[PDB]
Design a protein around this ligand. Sequence first.
Ligand code: NA
Ligand code: NA
Lengths: 408, 411, 106, 106
Amino acid sequence: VAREALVDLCRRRHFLSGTPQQLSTAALLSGCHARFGPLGVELRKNLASQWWSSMVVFREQVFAVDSLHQEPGSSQPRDSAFRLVSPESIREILQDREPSKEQLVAFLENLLKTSGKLRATLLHGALEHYVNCLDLVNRKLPFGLAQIGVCFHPVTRVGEKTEASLVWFTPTRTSSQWLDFWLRHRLLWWRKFAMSPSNFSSADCQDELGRKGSKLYYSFPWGKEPIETLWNLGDQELLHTYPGNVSTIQGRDGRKNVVPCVLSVSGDVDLGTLAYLYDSFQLAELQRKVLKLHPCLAPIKVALDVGKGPTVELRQVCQGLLNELLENGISVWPGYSETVHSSLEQLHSKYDEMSVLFSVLVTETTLENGLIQLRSRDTTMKEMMHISKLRDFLVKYLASASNVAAAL
Amino acid sequence: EALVDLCRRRHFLSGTPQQLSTAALLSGCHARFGPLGVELRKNLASQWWSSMVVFREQVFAVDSLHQEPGSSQPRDSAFRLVSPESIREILQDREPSKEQLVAFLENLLKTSGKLRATLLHGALEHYVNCLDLVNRKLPFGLAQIGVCFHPVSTRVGEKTEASLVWFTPTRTSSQWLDFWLRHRLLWWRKFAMSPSNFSSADCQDELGRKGSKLYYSFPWGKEPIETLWNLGDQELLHTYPGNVSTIQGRDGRKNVVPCVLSVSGDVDLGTLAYLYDSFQLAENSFARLQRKVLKLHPCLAPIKVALDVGKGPTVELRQVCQGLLNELLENGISVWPGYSETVHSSLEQLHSKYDEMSVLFSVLVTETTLENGLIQLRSRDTTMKEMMHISKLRDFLVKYLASASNVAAAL
Amino acid sequence: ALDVGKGPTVELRQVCQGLLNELLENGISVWPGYSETVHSSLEQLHSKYDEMSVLFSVLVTETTLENGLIQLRSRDTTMKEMMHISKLRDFLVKYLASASNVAAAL
Amino acid sequence: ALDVGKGPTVELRQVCQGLLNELLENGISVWPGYSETVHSSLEQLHSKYDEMSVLFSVLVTETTLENGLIQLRSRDTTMKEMMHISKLRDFLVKYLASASNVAAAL
DNA sequence: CTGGTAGGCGCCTACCAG
DNA sequence: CTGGTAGGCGCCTACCAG
DNA sequence: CTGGTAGGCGCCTACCAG
DNA sequence: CTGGTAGGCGCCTACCAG
Ligand code: NA
Ligand code: NA
């Protein structure tokens, strides 16, 4: 009942996309379809932008890495990674010449041995770029490699999920404290944008080899779902990536040459986007459906609309106002450009369901004294302010909101 | 080539020397870019999204999977996605026959999914959902930046594609295609040192559909970096078979089935183009001497400022750099923390490194800075040094990047 | 501003006339410093043009008669640069077109 | 002079507005006749521009929205010509430059 | 305050002959 | 086809209701 | 393993050369 | 100007007995 209204709202306002069968909980968690619509892409884009800011830009010695979605194939038993086969190579044996029974078995056997596979994590990409980045940092430990990309997980169907990975290379001497540092840092990052930060929790975990780690969860209406995993992998994966002389992969821990310990920090950006959508849905006031996404994450910051007055002159004021806001990094919904006229009540409900932070109305009064009508999403309050002050207000509001979360 | 050697030394590119050849870089069979190359491509994708989505009317974002539904097209060369468990279910469960093996390969060629080659179908499948968003008002567009997969003469290569699928009535289809062609070519040239190396040429497909391709003049010859097509309405009807009323748009007051325009650019090859375009053999002083310097456009240069310390108390100097680094980062200015490096470098060694890394400005904090607040500022393009108060550095950089972003908008 | 350096003054000033004519035909104001016959040092000449707000100073020398390279000096940066005399017109029209569009945004 | 013909006035005025901005940025004086709301026949409109000594009259029509062709009328010869709208800027700049170079030879 | 509406008059579409 | 008016069409103000 | 000094280690500033 | 360097003295490492 309540969970059905949110997905219906996100589908109506184009946060999500797909048929009703693809909008179920199990279908959204699998990731077997393009889950997000235009608003959902921009929200995830703002979520990935905030991740990159707090994990790369303002972090010391964290660098970017690019890796292919494909990894070299091998014959490890039960790898489950989908293999990449050329359709011409299959047609090159069924149409070129008449094959034999023994030749067909060798073709399927060579497929499991040589064909590439889709990546499941971004860990291997960072391990393969470790040596190249080691020269960049002058072999000074610690440092990290970060990347945001789509990974592939088996579900007969294939699922795609956007992973935000940070692979931290640290000495074993301080490996436990860096793992604890990132754990507290990642959990504060999820909670600073949340209306109910208590729904984001953490729990320790171990793998088969007893390596200690921790996972982050969000409390969905059906239960907790893991959104981020942190692992203390040690130095096992790094030695297998570079077999041979360890001197080529040894880092400098102050004055000691040590093979570094690898920390894997992997977060689900797609599932986190759904988490904030559930976190933002609240019924307030007479009840109203309003999504209160954090101002740094809300895809649309301001909406421009016209009221009573000369339509040509009013749209010219909106066009110039839209350009000034876009030139200052403020996303604008050009409601004035829509040919379908809407009432203020219908307009306020649409923008509240689209998580639009502020609604602006340009009227004939604006053409006389320059005053526009400003409506807040969170407080429903209307107020009159001069159009020349709108840019500074929105810029300072977004700057203030981004800095309140930093102190938390 | 001295540039590929330079880009590998400064971590614009990555890979062994065998995969750093021309044919290997064009195939895209390996992760080509290093940390600086990723940031350059990221700034190129940001500038693309700004001039193609943000400041364009009725252009919206679209997300699509890397997989497309499989079918039995004979001319389809896209790599297929096969479950490895289904392969072991026929080679290990029971002893198969020849008829069972052929039926397995035939069923996979008809049902197994395939990796996408373009972003066109992803926008076509989201056309109806976005048509309701615009209240059926034509024209509008769907844009997406993602990695596509291309077969290589078997190995498979990956290339980042910046796609814009424009839905417009056929009445104005030819003029919208000409509009985007001029807009894309001006976008490439505004960041280029030699804009004449970016050219355009008309082309046609198998069915005679008119289009245009953009090229960059690499040292070995022109290479296509962007393709524009006037596809008509063929792909849109095959995507939505049935009643055309569900896909009809509003051309002013007339309900018509829109014409599809595809604008796809190669982001990976475009970064290689700007790396070749930025390399020049300038001279810091002809009469005491050439220098290898990459003059990437300020909007594209991955590192805007570099911070280093000079003579003076190292503790106090690094505290000033840390506070200065935070102020620049908080204002969207990328900073290279050269002061945090433990290896000491001379100014000449430091100037050549920052020039090869295309760092726009080099700042040196010295004992003088602790006395009167003056830092040393060096320009990448002119190699000139200047004393400037540290309180004015942020304003100078944000206005320099603002000016640079405004001449390119006027060109 | 156009001036001559070391070399035969007759042939160097003839090159300056053709260069001045090409610049005037493209709307570029030129100070014919080469036509002045009084003795002047480079320090006095640079101080004169910098105080007259001359954007660029060009010097035609015996090198220009051999390979076509002239000496270009910037007012703002005092930086000297060697460029071919045939490319001077393109450099000036692009620099002046850029400055008008830098201030057009502000 | 810029004017609109048969077709959606709103769409045609947007094309004329963008064409006027490109011509003004290249030093070409434009008469924005498209901004007038009162109807005037082509005969009445051409007689006004001839009396105003307007060198060329341009007409943006529905055909311009389809293939980009505009109608160009010369003042001296009263001849109509169809040319692509992207070539109007290059044509006017060279025509004005040619007239100035022919008069310089007199 | 806000939306639904009726109607005068100028702007604009598109008739409709050559 | 093309271009001139005839005439349809939508903007804007004012009144009203809830 | 713990802690208090003994002793090494690196910062800082004058020279010197190119 | 700038880089290479030598050395006095306080900061810091890590000796080395309990
Ligand atoms: Na009509
Ligand atoms: Na010690």
